[PDB]
UniProtKB/Swiss-Prot annotation:
Primary role: Excises uracil residues from the DNA which can arise as a result of misincorporation of dUMP residues by DNA polymerase or due to deamination of cytosine.
CDD domains assigned to the protein according to its UniProt record, in alphabetical order: UDG-F1-like (cd10027)
Organism ancestry: Bacteria, Thermotogati, Deinococcota, Deinococci, Deinococcales
Stored InterPro entries: UDG_fam1, Ura-DNA_Glyclase_AS, Uracil-DNA_glycosylase-like, Uracil-DNA_glycosylase-like_sf
Location(s) in or outside the cell: Cytoplasm
Active-site annotation: 67 (proton acceptor)
Keyword Translocase: no
Name of the protein this chain belongs to: Uracil-DNA glycosylase
Keywords noted in UniProt: Cytoplasm, DNA damage, DNA repair, Hydrolase
GO cellular component: cytoplasm
Protein species of origin: Deinococcus radiodurans (strain ATCC 13939 / DSM 20539 / JCM 16871 / CCUG 27074 / LMG 4051 / NBRC 15346 / NCIMB 9279 / VKM B-1422 / R1)
GO process annotations (BP): base-excision repair, AP site formation via deaminated base removal
Domain of life: Bacteria
Chief site of localization: cytoplasm
Amino acid sequence: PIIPANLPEDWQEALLPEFSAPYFHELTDFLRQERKEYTIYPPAPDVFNALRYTPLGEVKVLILGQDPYHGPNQAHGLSFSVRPGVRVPPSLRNIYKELTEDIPGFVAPKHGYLRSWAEQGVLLLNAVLTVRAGQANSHQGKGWEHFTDAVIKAVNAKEERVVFILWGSYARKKKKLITGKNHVVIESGHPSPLSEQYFFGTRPFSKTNEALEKAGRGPVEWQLPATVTE
């Protein structure tokens, strides 16, 4: 139980202090109990999928969301992404509009599934990793934020350049944690339709690849497969 199931070895090094800490045991007890009274998203085996697909040593970019999508079949343990065959949410649709204008030759897919960004170093981290069906922010301040702050600080600890993409007011509160000399913070309003005029024209995807390239790192290939792949 103490260390979750199929986790890369660098995240074990990094996050053992978190996994064995009191606040984390109380959080998992909370979740055990929440899951017998409510449907909680994502499923238990997916909660840490961001860390599975993107080992600490392969992190190039960190794209922070708030909490998981809270409807059926959406959330699968990654920020912003949804499962194949599920309608692309409003924020992801705008992400795609901006990608088509920012990355010459990017072709928007019909799906919302972003595992291919994860499998190439994009850490798709929500600040809060679980939720009650129907209820946004229902697991806010139960312990996930101590945990995901510690994911964030471990990524900040890396010598090699990481681009931290902070979209919207919640995310931008983490700017203070990014102190590493080689890191880059790309900030703007959130892709959400409520705030989209502060997101369009910001070119976060090209600035990211430009920053990586300056530090001798490889760019992200933002193109998604046309069909997926679960």
